[PDB]
């Protein structure tokens, strides 16, 4: 396989460490503890994810409305 | 309505040992 780069502003497929999803990558102002992989909301959907290589926190904005 | 995604981002952890 081959790694890919990041497209923040467009709805695209998300596969991170096996976790599948779809949404928009946005800048996250929320503080996370480095000892955790990712986090989710009460809807059992991923609202944020941490990049495995570089340390960062990005929010998952839902797409496909209608 | 539905918005179908286009590109695909695949990020795997940097591999120290295969």
């Amino acid at each position, epitope marked *: 396989k081959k790694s890919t780069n990041l497209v*923040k*502003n467009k709805c695209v497929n998300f596969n991170f460490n096996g976790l599948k999803g779809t949404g928009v990558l946005t800048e996250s*102002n929320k503080k996370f503890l480095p000892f955790q992989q990712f986090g989710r909301d009460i809807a059992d959907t991923t609202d944020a994810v941490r990049d495995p290589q*570089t340390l960062e926190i990005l929010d998952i904005t839902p797409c496909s409305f209608g | 309505f539905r918005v179908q995604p286009t590109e695909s981002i695949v990020r795997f952890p940097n591999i120290t040992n295969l």
Partner: antibody
Amino acid sequence: QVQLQQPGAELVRPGASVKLSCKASGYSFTRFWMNWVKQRPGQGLEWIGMIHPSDSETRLNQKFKDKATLTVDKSSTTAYMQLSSPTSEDSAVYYCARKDYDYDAWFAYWGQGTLVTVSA
Amino acid sequence: DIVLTQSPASLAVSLGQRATISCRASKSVSASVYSYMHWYQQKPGQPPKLLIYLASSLESGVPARFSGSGSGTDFTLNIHPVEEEDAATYYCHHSRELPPAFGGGTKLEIKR
């Protein structure tokens, strides 16, 4: 090696159409964004807009709405930008930069620039 | 949006001194323990180039005399030791919000 090419200068009369060329080589023209920057001498840099070449979706500044128009040709991997009815205040230097995304988004590479002079 | 204000407009720094340029943001761009900022160097007749990204690192090929730090709105960017080739126009940028904005610019004069 990644290199961006643009023509040196272009002459246009007011009321006509302006067509610019940004050539991409060495990287995938689809996966990466293409951003445009307007540099007017003495006014500093200005942000024109962005375009996603796959879906043609564009992002335009509030000031350049209804004026600038962005389009891409995926066959030759060359991005185009048009300006409807350019005036004397629209004369400036135009760049096309690529955003390499690691955490925050900066401008990794730049073009040569094209001087658009509007004069009869 | 976020409008960037740089002061002063023209800074005169001689050989052996330290330069300071402040880029203010209307809103806080700091998120995830880091901050969103970038600082460029544009010479006349040449396109700008990346130097320091995210204030915490130095781009490859850029000399060590360029340093940066600061948190919150007001940032401070230092240069030392200053060299005769450091005269150019400097800018600051933030990619957080959208549509993004560019700095006002600062001209650096090398005293002789």
